[PDB]
Design an enzyme around this catalytic site. Structure first.
Site, short mmCIF file in Angstrom:
data_model
loop_
_atom_site.label_atom_id
_atom_site.label_comp_id
_atom_site.label_asym_id
_atom_site.label_seq_id
_atom_site.Cartn_x
_atom_site.Cartn_y
_atom_site.Cartn_z
N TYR A 129 0.81 -1.17 0.00
CA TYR A 129 0.00 0.00 0.00
C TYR A 129 0.88 1.26 0.00
CZ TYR A 129 -4.65 -2.30 0.20
OH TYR A 129 -5.82 -3.01 -0.15
N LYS A 179 -0.73 -15.11 4.02
CA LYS A 179 -0.96 -16.04 2.92
C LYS A 179 0.42 -16.61 2.53
CE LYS A 179 -3.52 -18.54 0.61
NZ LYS A 179 -4.88 -18.95 0.27
N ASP A 212 -7.95 -16.07 3.40
CA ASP A 212 -9.22 -16.61 2.94
C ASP A 212 -9.91 -17.45 4.01
OD1 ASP A 212 -7.24 -18.53 2.42
OD2 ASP A 212 -8.22 -19.26 0.58
N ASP A 236 -6.40 -4.37 5.70
CA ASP A 236 -7.37 -3.43 5.16
C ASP A 236 -8.70 -4.10 5.00
OD1 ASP A 236 -8.07 -0.79 4.27
OD2 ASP A 236 -7.47 -1.21 2.19
N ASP A 240 -12.29 -4.09 7.92
CA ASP A 240 -13.61 -3.77 7.40
C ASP A 240 -14.65 -4.88 7.51
OD1 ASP A 240 -12.70 -1.15 6.90
OD2 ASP A 240 -13.35 -1.22 4.82
#
Ligand code: CL
Ligand code: CL
Ligand code: CL
Ligand code: CL
Lengths: 337, 337
Positions: A129, A179, A212, A236, A240
């Protein structure tokens, strides 16, 4: 406390921040409040997004309380990259702290009112980011675009330690989410860092989930989480999602924290500026006031932070479906201190 | 007519694949099947994971049906990378199809059994789930690790064009999910491609959501989705979440599609090999059998798929709760064929 910089910001920012300041003022009188004009208003009035001189002013305060940033009049990405992310970089806000608690009086979109009480510690200053990459042959069938995520032991260790400290003070369970089977370099840095820092926390149980699979558990088994630590990009998304399961980003608060205290940390509600209702007194200030509790806790005003927590919790438990104006919400919370 | 390659594979692979095969030639007559010992058996047997001679052999079939691969028996990553990923890349499976439907008799972990029927089209062959990156100074405070996401007009238009077609043939709504405000190079490419491709599809309404927003909406408002197109990394996350909200990965099917038909496509149930119940005839073969219906609908054989669908729906809408063995569930699905 002592000195608070306030960046009320755009749209609903002013009216929720005003109610936050009121609650702060009640639990810690005689704090010097200094108000800064940043975002759409400043951008139009001066052409400025984040001057270095303003950043230096910001350093003179103990903490920053922010409302919301953005307006449809200002182009999509500009304030967000040039003010929000930039402040995060310039103030070394490497810890993004995102509590996720489901409260009596708040509806979850999940079946069966599950108990939910966790905290997400997201790395704030590196990874994907930062804007590292580029493109070639843009606008042709031959275009190639690359995005580069830079990860460092420096950055990772910081955020991991903080999360272990949070875990020790809570239910002593830490879940790293990443991951690692597919981002083998970033992933291995993260795995090894949690393991090495974990040596100093034999009291904290540590688990690992892929992002996931963690996404699935947040939906089917959110009660399994105590502290979650993750990177900038995965964080991020999951911060949320956490907000969504705990009754929405409108009820969520965020800390942007330099844990060395070299710079002032910043606290805000997660929601945005909702310009279509700006100034109408409809916006709920509960999130903004919950960000004041984070801020107080960060500054070691722990009894005063508990008071705000309790007063938010009381409000949520009796609000029901009543139509309450921004200032009616702030009054209810104030009266419960 | 059709040549099917069959890779039952590992753990419970054989068992649910046995059912799917049984279902298959009970709705399409002349399916010329070839067995492939690939996975843990082959590895332990020979050392071989996926020899080139074998890929070349697979290319001479019209589809591949797969059950599952993986065993703790085999060292982390050996089969996932060297068999599973290698097959995807070698056979140009650039489209990952992940349909998301909550069916009658299936409980969603979300509130109020809402309407959910959408498809996820996920880029399959580029992005950072390719192994592109490195590290310096590993195991020190100066460690730096990079991951690199490579995105191309070539790869992106293909996936996007396949999505727009899926949209047209459904509710003519396509959502692009990315993070264009901060993955500015990849983001720009995806955005511009969706705009440009979409000019042969004025029937399709086109919507953009950042991935964090999409995840919230997948749980608060999943009904707003028809087709989702996204990249490899974000698709990996949103595919698993969609499965969860539609009642679980255990009931999810996946197409791995070369939409040029130069290579055979592969179809499989999403779930893994579950070594713990290998050979107890407990494993539920439904999704494996759902993977047959995608295999069929891709091979042009609509009616056999149009059927098989209904037999699965019947199975789920009437199963109630009784423990069924693999072969029982297999046998039940016949009836409504
Ligand atoms: Cl904001
Ligand atoms: Cl905490
Ligand atoms: Cl954010
Ligand atoms: Cl489709």
């Amino acid at each position: 406390m002592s000195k608070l910089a306030i960046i009320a910001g755009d749209g609903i920012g002013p009216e929720v921040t005003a109610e936050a300041v009121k609650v702060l003022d009640a639990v810690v009188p005689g704090v010097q409040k200094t108000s800064y004009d940043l975002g759409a208003r400043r951008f139009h009035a001066t052409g400025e997004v984040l001057p270095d001189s303003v950043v230096a002013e910001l350093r003179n305060h103990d903490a920053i309380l922010l409302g919301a940033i953005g307006d449809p009049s200002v182009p999509s990405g500009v304030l967000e990259r040039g003010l929000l992310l930039r402040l995060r970089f310039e103030l070394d806000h490497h810890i993004n702290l995102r509590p996720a608690r489901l409260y009596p009086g708040v509806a979850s979109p999940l079946s069966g009112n599950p108990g939910i009480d966790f905290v997400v510690v997201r790395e704030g200053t590196e990874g994907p980011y930062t804007g590292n990459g580029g493109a070639i042959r843009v606008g042709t069938p031959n275009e190639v675009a690359t995005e580069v995520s830079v990860n460092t032991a420096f950055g990772v260790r910081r955020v991991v330690a903080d999360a272990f400290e949070r875990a020790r003070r809570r239910r002593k369970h830490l879940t790293l989410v990443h991951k690692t089977n597919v981002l083998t370099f970033a992933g291995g840095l993260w795995l090894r860092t949690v393991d090495e820092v974990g040596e100093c926390y034999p009291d904290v149980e540590v688990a690992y989930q892929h992002v996931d699979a963690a996404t699935i558990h947040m939906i089917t088994d959110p009660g399994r989480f105590d502290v979650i630590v993750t990177d900038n990009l995965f964080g991020d998304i999951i911060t949320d999602l956490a907000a969504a399961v705990c009754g929405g980003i409108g009820l969520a608060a965020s800390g942007n924290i330099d844990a060395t205290r070299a710079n002032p940390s910043m606290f805000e509600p997660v929601h945005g500026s909702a310009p279509d209702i700006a100034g109408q007194g409809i916006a709920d200030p509960t999130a903004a006031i919950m960000s004041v509790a984070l801020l107080l806790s960060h500054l070691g005003e722990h009894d005063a932070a508990a008071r705000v927590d309790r007063a938010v919790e009381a409000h949520l438990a009796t609000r029901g479906s009543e139509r309450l104006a921004t200032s009616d919400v702030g009054e209810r919370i104030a009266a419960a201190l």
